[PDB]
Amino acid sequence: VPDYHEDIHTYLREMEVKCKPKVGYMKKQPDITNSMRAILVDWLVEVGEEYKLQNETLHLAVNYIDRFLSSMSVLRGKLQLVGTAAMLLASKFEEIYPPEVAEFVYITDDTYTKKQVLRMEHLVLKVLTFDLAAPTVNQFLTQYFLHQQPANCKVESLAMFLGELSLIDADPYLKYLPSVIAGAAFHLALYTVTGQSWPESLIRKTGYTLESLKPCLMDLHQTYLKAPQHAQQSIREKYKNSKYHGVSLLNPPETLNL
Amino acid sequence: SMENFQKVEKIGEGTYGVVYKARNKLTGEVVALKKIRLEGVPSTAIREISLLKELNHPNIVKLLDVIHTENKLYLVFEFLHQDLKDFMDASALTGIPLPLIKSYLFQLLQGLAFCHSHRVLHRDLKPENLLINTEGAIKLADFGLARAFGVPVRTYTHEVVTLWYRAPEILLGCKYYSTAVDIWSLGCIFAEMVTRRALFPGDSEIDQLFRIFRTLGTPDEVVWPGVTSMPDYKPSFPKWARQDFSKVVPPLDEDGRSLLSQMLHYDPNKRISAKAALAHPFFQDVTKPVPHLRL
Numbered sequence: 069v070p071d072y073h074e075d076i077h078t079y080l081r082e083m084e085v086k087c088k089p090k091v092g093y094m095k096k097q098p099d100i101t102n103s104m105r106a107i108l109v110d111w112l113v114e115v116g117e118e119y120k121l122q123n124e125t126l127h128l129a130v131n132y133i134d135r136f137l138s139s140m141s142v143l144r145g146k147l148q149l150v151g152t153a154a155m156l157l158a159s160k161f162e163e164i165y166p167p168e169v170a171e172f173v174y175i176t177d178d179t180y181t182k183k184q185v186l187r188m189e190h191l192v193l194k195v196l197t198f199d200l201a202a203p204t205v206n207q208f209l210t211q212y213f214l215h216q217q218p219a220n221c222k223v224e225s226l227a228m229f230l231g232e233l234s235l236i237d238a239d240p241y242l243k244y245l246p247s248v249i250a251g252a253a254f255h256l257a258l259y260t261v262t263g264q265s266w267p268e269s270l271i272r273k274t275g276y277t278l279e280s281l282k283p284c285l286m287d288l289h290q291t292y293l294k295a296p297q298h299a300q301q302s303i304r305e306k307y308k309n310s311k312y313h314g315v316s317l318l319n320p321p322e323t324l325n326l
Numbered sequence: 327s328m329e330n331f332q333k334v335e336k337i338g339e340g341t342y343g344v345v346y347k348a349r350n351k352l353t354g355e356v357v358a359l360k361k362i363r364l365e366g367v368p369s370t371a372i373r374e375i376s377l378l379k380e381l382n383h384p385n386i387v388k389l390l391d392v393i394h395t396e397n398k399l400y401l402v403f404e405f406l407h408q409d410l411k412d413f414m415d416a417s418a419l420t421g422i423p424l425p426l427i428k429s430y431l432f433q434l435l436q437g438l439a440f441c442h443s444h445r446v447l448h449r450d451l452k453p454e455n456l457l458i459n460t461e462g463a464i465k466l467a468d469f470g471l472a473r474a475f476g477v478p479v480r481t482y483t484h485e486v487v488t489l490w491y492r493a494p495e496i497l498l499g500c501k502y503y504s505t506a507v508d509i510w511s512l513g514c515i516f517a518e519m520v521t522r523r524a525l526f527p528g529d530s531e532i533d534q535l536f537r538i539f540r541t542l543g544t545p546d547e548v549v550w551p552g553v554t555s556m557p558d559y560k561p562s563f564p565k566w567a568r569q570d571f572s573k574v575v576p577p578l579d580e581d582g583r584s585l586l587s588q589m590l591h592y593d594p595n596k597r598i599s600a601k602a603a604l605a606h607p608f609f610q611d612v613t614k615p616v617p618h619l620r621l
């Protein structure tokens with residue numbers, strides 16, 4: 069635990085508020101829906117799997133898209149282009165070895181040209197005013213993981229799985245901050261695997277009580293229970309892999325006793 | 327908009343792009359312009375802009391504007407006077423007094439503490455990337471090689487940092503490195519300012535390591551737990567004794583030697599943080615002396 073853990077947590081809490089997308093933007097979108105966004109985010113999950121990208125890169129891309137769509141109307145035939153440009157930018161930001169532009173053009177089944185992707189990258193950058201270092205659910209989770217007594221790999225992968233599922237459904241997860249989703253996902257993962265709850269040390273670090281996380285927790289518990297029946301399945305498929313300790317094969321709890 | 331700027335001269339090339347001196351025709355403000363010609367927008371530029379927009383501190387170069395056009399990208403910075411490498415090249419042997427060095431190090435540690443507190447690793451701290459003004463200020467510049475790190479860190483890009491200023495954990499290939507790498511660089515720079523020559527001027531990775539070992543001793547398990555298990559550690563490494571810091575940096579006082587020692591500790595988590603270094607007795611009498619004006 070470095071000399072900067074507290075400073076960083078505090079800073080990320082400030083920045084998550086400033087980086088927050090507009091909660092009700094989908095209503096103001098004339099052509100796209102939450103369902104269409106769910107299809108996009110599920111597809112980005114596949115792209116991340118194909119090119120072995122960091123989960124963080126995935127979380128960053130989704131943040132960029134939601135912020136972009138918070139001020140920019142996009143026709144349905146152009147949503148994937150926005151998504152491709154966002155994944156490219158997230159990759160340049162976060163990855164040691166980003167996939168090349170030509171590789172992003174390839175996984176868009178040649179719907180778009182290289183020039184289009186490049187021009188969309190420029191526009192995304194303009195709209196986001198080059199502000200790409202956004203806090204994510206993932207960034208809060210890795211901080212929360214340091215409070216395990218002791219560390220449990222299955223809990224870690226389950227938390228990341230749950231937090232990843234929240235990316236798919238703008239309704240309702242758009243209203244929740246990354247730090248809150250991470251708290252809900254960590255508690256839910258901790259409960260499912262060990263039986264333990266949101267720990268006291270995190271209550272004191274975050275200022276979040278079980279009660280304060282309850283709204284998000286109730287939603288996340290439901291997404292978890294309904295996950296096998298969800299239209300989008302790439303995250304469950306992903307989290308079957310031994311790399312994530314096959315946590316999507318684990319049984320969700322029947323009740324949380326809140 | 328580039329209309330309001332009149333370019334004066336080319337200064338050089340950074341981590342990426344080319345740096346020019348320019349003047350705002352309307353305000354009179356002298357600025358530095360970092361031009362990039364447009365694989366899309368480079369990772370280095372994306373990182374520098376995003377992070378430098380977040381970082382507002384007296385000892386971090388101020389990014390004033392981003393001029394974003396179809397074929398060219400300009401970053402607009404405040405212009406200061408000169409980079410530290412040029413300052414040292416322009417300085418006579420006695421030209422950089424200890425009080426100025428102490429002031430510069432104090433300020434660099436402030437700038438770095440700020441970076442690290444805001445989850446940013448610089449990863450290219452060397453004299454060329456440090457800028458001085460005529461009033462005694464020094465600032466971190468060129469964040470092209472920087473990145474936003476996580477808590478705890480993942481494995482990031484290997485072989486980072488200009489060779490002479492590169493920490494032993496990078497050289498020995500450790501899976502993880504973090505904030506400690508920037509402190510190592512600053513320590514090398516500290517010694518360089520005092521002695522007026524680079525501390526470890528290696529020409530290859532092994533030469534770099536062997537130079538470090540001859541000054542600080544060859545690390546073993548006692549000084550650096552886990553060192554013998556590190557990927558690029560070799561049991562055939564020659565054994566050298568650590569030397570007295572009175573001999574490594576002769577002009578330096580007892581407090582100075584103490585601080586340098588803590589900045590060049592082998593073990594990254596025993597190595598002093600920028601935050602903790604600000605309270606070191608070396609800075610008890612720190613002022614803000616003014617440098618000479620020679621270019």
Ligand SMILES: O=C1N=C(NCc2cccs2)S/C1=C/c1ccc2ncccc2c1
Binds near residue numbers: 338404405457
């Ligand atoms: O000085 C800068 N250096 C950068 N990267 C490496 C280089 C050092 C010298 C030439 S290139 S980016 C940068 C911006 C900048 C801002 C203010 C300045 N004031 C005076 C002199 C150079 C300046 C450069």
